[PDB]
Ligand SMILES: *[C@@H]1O[C@H](CO)[C@@H](O[C@@H]2O[C@H](CO)[C@@H](O)[C@H](O)[C@H]2NC(C)=O)[C@H](O)[C@H]1NC(C)=O
Ligand SMILES: *[C@@H]1O[C@H](CO)[C@@H](O[C@@H]2O[C@H](CO)[C@@H](O)[C@H](O)[C@H]2NC(C)=O)[C@H](O)[C@H]1NC(C)=O
Ligand SMILES: *[C@@H]1O[C@H](CO)[C@@H](O[C@@H]2O[C@H](CO)[C@@H](O)[C@H](O)[C@H]2NC(C)=O)[C@H](O)[C@H]1NC(C)=O
């Protein structure tokens with residue numbers, strides 16, 4: 001689940017991977033590249049059987 | 050005019066719920082129950098899950114904001130002096146008791162043990178409050194020690210010490226009772242105070258309903274949670290109420306419609322829960338804002354707002370923590386033993402109309418006196434004590450009398 | 465659907481209001497803090513004038529005038545009241 | 560400095576709502592009244608009423 | 609019906625705020641004399657009925 | 658000793674014009690034995 | 703048997719006829735502590751209600767944040783009186799919140 | 814509802830519906846409560 005930042009020129013300039021690391025997980029959750037300081041809830045995990 | 054000859058110092062409790070449990074539920078689990086073949090379908094309903102989660106998280110952070118605003122009124126925490134000579138006033142019933150593992154006060158302990166709700170379910174969870182009960186107790190102890198040991202100054206600048214009998218003299222003077230009323234009855238005052246304070250504990254032990262305004266809140270939350278989880282038992286017109294049965298008995302192309310019915314029902318139930326929670330959180334926020342206003346304008350000072358701080362003239366209020374709420378012990382000076390005298394608006398001496406400086410004219414049948422308006426303390430009526438304005442002809446209800454000129458005897462003696 | 469009656473009938477609410485009003489007239493502000501204690505009304509108005517920072521005499525010296533204004537004002541509002549109550553009409557209309 | 564020399568005691572109204580009509584509606588008989596067939600179906604939705 | 613109940617909850621919350629304001633207004637203006645500026649009518653406050 | 662207004666330190670000699678009398682020196686707790694200057698005596702002298 | 707809902711709390715094994723109880727296995731929400739992308743890029747994860755640098759708290763299992771002894775007026779809230787921040791010296795530290803500086807007012811009956 | 818049609822609404826429930834003591838008020842009729850000419854605080 002990639003989040004891609006398009007540009008006014010129409011050309012993709014950068015991308016973020018939803019599962020690369022928790023920071024990128026937030027960046028996907030907020031739907032914004034920049035994440036401000038604080039505590040962020042991202043997902044809910046269950047132990048696989 | 051009837052004016053008092055005595056007073057009683059009464060402390061009245063006021064409960065205020067300042068926060069509620071920080072519940073959160075992940076829409077995905079509650080609706081789909083970790084059935085990926087059902088989460089895929091739920092994904093077709095849009096951003097409902099995210100919206101509900103956002104609303105619940107907002108309420109959750111707002112609860113901690115409420116507690117912070119209500120309690121953390123002091124930039125620094127004060128420690129009451131080891132020696133407990135407060136001029137006869139006995140605060141042992143509100144101040145923290147070191148004789149227990151928890152740093153609570155006897156009133157706080159009784160208050161906390163009188164409110165009661167480990168249960169875990171699918172999706173539903175409760176987050177701990179930011180300020181643990183120990184920290185809320187520490188804030189309450191800080192405010193309480195500050196108000197005992199530094200008057201109202203600690204709330205509006207640096208903490209300026211002041212002997213407690215003098216602080217209560219100031220608080221008396223703040224309601225129109227001169228200072229000499231307190232000192233000349235200091236011991237009596239103290240006793241009443243002490244008695245009242247002790248009495249409050251028994252009142253909190255009188256009935257289980259004392260903490261009702263808090264209990265209700267808890268109950269309400271519990272009710273909502275119950276009726277949410279119980280809604281998982283309903284099937285909303287499908288052939289079964291459990292997604293596992295649906296997916297084990299029916300193939301995907303056919304089970305899709307039944308899962309659609311279940312998704313719609315579960316989503317509607319959770320939406321109703323979230324909306325009710327938003328209304329309830331707004332109500333609790335209003336209550337917590339009122340609690341913060343009371344803590345600021347009563348504990349940190351002395352209010353002229355007549356019934357803001359219980360019946361009587363407000364003197365001082367000590368806060369106490371309570372599970373998801375605060376309790377104020379509003380101390381109030383209440384007149385009593387009223388005696389009724391004849392009164393006049395102004396006296397006349399040599400045609401000059403003398404009006405009382407700040408008190409009021411009262412006659413014990415024979416000759417007049419000037420007494421402050423809230424405690425019968427007759428003083429000889431003198432030109433120093435009463436000012437002058439106009440003459441006889443204007444005021445109605447005037448009464449002839451002689452106002453002692455304090456300089457007459459010394460003038461005659463020395464000339 | 466049904467509408468449950470209010471706990472306090474309009475008569476009981478009017479009785480409460482009359483009690484508050486007579487207490488204010490005949491005891492000033494004392495009935496709201498402790499036991500109600502009488503005080504002649506012009507003296508109570510002197511107390512209140514002192515409250516707003518105008519010395520006692522300024523009332524008595526022209527008490528008559530004060531009273532007249534009061535009376536007139538009260539009359540006026542009745543005539544002004546028979547013009548509004550939009551704050552309550554709005555509630556009932558919304559419901 | 561400008562000092563007052565006279566007064567004009569004024570009386571002003573202020574209307575305040577205090578309570579609204581206490582309405583109460585049966586959900587069971589509102590969704591479908593005196594029809595057991597629909598009441599049985601409505602019972603499926605659970606504790607909405 | 610759910611819509612009606614939710615809207616009634618909102619409206620009753622508004623009316624409850626108004627009733628709390630009326631309660632404090634009666635306490636502070638009627639049972640006493642208030643120093644709050646525009647709380648009890650415009651001008652300096654004497655007494656409310 | 659001195660008399661000073663609260664919440665700002667402005668000492669003033671204790672005088673009959675800023676203190677009011679009461680009691681008999683036996684009921685109040687914690688009194689002190691200082692004196693009050695009387696403005697009338699210098700005028701008389 | 704059953705719990706308050708239709709979810710099964712206990713079951714009898716049809717083979718050995720033995721009683722057993724069922725509990726949903728370890729689960730919970732996950733959050734992350736970040737001091738701001740425009741000031742750093744490390745982050746410390748927090749499992750809300752799971753049992754486990756690594757660190758355990760009444761608010762859950764916090765990893766990636768290093769415990770520190772002392773306390774400061776705290777930046778961001780974790781829970782249960784525990785906060786965290788990128789202060790102190792280049793990583794997230796989770797501590798127990800401080801309320802305020804101690805201030806013993808010098809009180810005496812004639813002062 | 815009026816006190817006339819109340820009974821239309823086991824033996825104890827029948828008794829309560831019928832009512833050895835019936836009182837009529839603005840909030841409809843009630844059974845099992847004795848009506849007095851005294852007056853106390855709201856309970
Ligand atoms: C004002 O009231 C207090 C009581 O509220 C009076 O003090 C009481 O005096 C009686 C006299 O026999 C004692 O038995 C009580 O124990 C006292 N009570 C307390 C709490 O001290 C006081 O005397 C009254 N003052 C005046 C001037 O009447
Ligand atoms: C202040 O109040 C406390 C009670 O809150 C008093 O301590 C009690 O005193 C009574 C009478 O001697 C004893 O029976 C109790 O055992 C004491 N403890 C408790 C917890 O009640 C105390 O004596 C009062 N005075 C001072 C100066 O502290
Ligand atoms: C009314 O107040 C006076 C106080 O002045 C009481 O005391 C008497 O006062 C008069 C003149 O002031 C003196 O001549 C008497 O000797 C005072 N009596 C006593 C016993 O000291 C007076 O008792 C009060 N009551 C009445 C009915 O006058």
Ligand SMILES: *[C@@H]1O[C@H](CO)[C@@H](O[C@@H]2O[C@H](CO)[C@@H](O)[C@H](O)[C@H]2NC(C)=O)[C@H](O)[C@H]1NC(C)=O
Pocket residue numbers: 448449
């Ligand atoms: C109060 O004293 C005034 C002044 O002594 C009295 O007014 C006088 O009453 C006499 C009665 O014959 C008249 O002749 C005078 O003209 C009045 N005025 C003056 C300036 O002397 C008054 O009667 C006394 N009593 C009351 C109740 O006011």
Ligand SMILES: *[C@@H]1O[C@H](CO)[C@@H](O)[C@H](O)[C@H]1NC(C)=O
Pocket residue numbers: 009
């Ligand atoms: C990108 O933006 C610039 C802005 O001047 C423009 O000249 C250019 O044509 C745009 N597209 C590309 C491919 O450079």
Ligand SMILES: *[C@@H]1O[C@H](CO)[C@@H](O)[C@H](O)[C@H]1NC(C)=O
Pocket residue numbers: 389390391
């Ligand atoms: C005090 O009130 C009573 C009645 O309440 C009255 O009989 C008495 O005359 C009054 N006292 C005075 C001095 O007027």
Ligand SMILES: *[C@@H]1O[C@H](CO)[C@@H](O)[C@H](O)[C@H]1NC(C)=O
Pocket residue numbers: 445446447
């Ligand atoms: C009211 O009291 C005043 C006070 O002196 C008196 O002059 C007047 O006559 C009294 N009025 C009545 C009707 O008693």
Ligand SMILES: *[C@@H]1O[C@H](CO)[C@@H](O)[C@H](O)[C@H]1NC(C)=O
Pocket residue numbers: 564565566
């Ligand atoms: C104040 O206004 C009233 C109303 O017109 C008037 O009767 C009175 O004389 C005025 N006061 C003065 C001192 O002019």
Ligand SMILES: *[C@@H]1O[C@H](CO)[C@@H](O)[C@H](O)[C@H]1NC(C)=O
Pocket residue numbers: 686687811812
């Ligand atoms: C203060 O306490 C001391 C005992 O340490 C005592 O001698 C003194 O009289 C007390 N004074 C006041 C005003 O409380």
Ligand SMILES: *[C@@H]1O[C@H](CO)[C@@H](O)[C@H](O)[C@H]1NC(C)=O
Pocket residue numbers: 690
């Ligand atoms: C104050 O002075 C009086 C008389 O001079 C004396 O009786 C009393 O003991 C003195 N008190 C103190 C504390 O010095």
Ligand SMILES: *[C@@H]1O[C@H](CO)[C@@H](O)[C@H](O)[C@H]1NC(C)=O
Pocket residue numbers: 717718
């Ligand atoms: C079937 O199960 C029963 C119950 O444990 C056991 O006693 C029996 O031996 C089993 N038979 C076979 C063939 O596994």
Ligand SMILES: *[C@@H]1O[C@H](CO)[C@@H](O)[C@H](O)[C@H]1NC(C)=O
Pocket residue numbers: 753754
């Ligand atoms: C579970 O929690 C308890 C209590 O905090 C602790 O003693 C135990 O070590 C924990 N177990 C695991 C596997 O985290």
Ligand SMILES: *[C@@H]1O[C@H](CO)[C@@H](O)[C@H](O)[C@H]1NC(C)=O
Pocket residue numbers: 769770771
């Ligand atoms: C405080 O510091 C000492 C020394 O490093 C350490 O042993 C102890 O565990 C620390 N306490 C806490 C609560 O972190």
Ligand SMILES: *[C@@H]1O[C@H](CO)[C@@H](O)[C@H](O)[C@H]1NC(C)=O
Pocket residue numbers: 815816817
């Ligand atoms: C109830 O029935 C009685 C008897 O006919 C009648 O007099 C009364 O008006 C009725 N009241 C209502 C509210 O219908």
Ligand SMILES: *[C@@H]1O[C@H](CO)[C@@H](O)[C@H](O)[C@H]1NC(C)=O
Pocket residue numbers: 848849850
């Ligand atoms: C109560 O008042 C009513 C008024 O109609 C009267 O009929 C009745 O006899 C009185 N007493 C009782 C016990 O109802």
